[PDB]
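name: query_chain
kind: protein
chains: 1
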Amino acid sequence: SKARVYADVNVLRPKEYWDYEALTVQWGEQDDYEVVRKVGRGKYSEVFEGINVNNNEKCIIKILKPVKKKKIKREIKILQNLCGGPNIVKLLDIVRDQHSKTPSLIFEYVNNTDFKVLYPTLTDYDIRYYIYELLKALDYCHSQGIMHRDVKPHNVMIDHELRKLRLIDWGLAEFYHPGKEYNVRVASRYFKGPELLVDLQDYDYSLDMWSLGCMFAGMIFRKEPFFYGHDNHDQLVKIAKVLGTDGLNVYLNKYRIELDPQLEALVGRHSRKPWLKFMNADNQHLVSPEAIDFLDKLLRYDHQERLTALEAMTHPYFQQVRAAENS
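structure:
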């Protein structure tokens, strides 16, 4: 398998672009930044609202939990290569604590609303709008030869007042190289594509499009998250019970994948369920046939069949957002 687009980005660029292990970090001054309050955390870090003591401007301080220098260098290089891209978080400085040598990444401040409370109030247009803004970020990073690999609501920060969106936490992101076998232990379970769940390691940018599709389905059907599996095997089962196993086997046969017999039996056999069946009274105002058409073109087992981020931005579902932007 290879990416259908941007497959040669890292082939054509200087090895210094993608050879993140050769990174030399120019450490800043830890004292330039002061923690104000904790605003988030995950397995790999804690995130704080901070203040830049010099200009007294707000910023974000991401304190990294203990990990190999390789993973730290990877996130830093990706952030530096993407800096300035549309809707990409801006890495401003990198500092470390002397004694502990705990690294912190400093970002421009981002002022988000809890997705669990925001999403229920989004209008159909807001959905279309925010999804389009997220697409810009994904098309940009893919175009720069990078896969995010952890698209989920928690990593999409939205300032609803200002209608500003930022794709954050590049800690799981990787550089795309044709034929490379990547680790499938990426993304949040509910947003993992089938390729991850069936051990297809030579995946690509299209993984992020499945994740986006999961988010999107969640939003239009008001169902967070949409595919609610308890473990990785259950995750594929829940996907199979919607998409159907026919397409699953077609997919498995095309890429010559054999499922684990245990997994094969959990999955079983299931007919495809039309998207409309998920329609209900709470979600009805958000569910145009254009919504369904777009969603159906994202949530495909076959990563090669999925819309690219570029194609997605041009789907008629987004026509009003494009018209508005074009002024």
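note: Residues 124-143 form the longest helix (20 residues).
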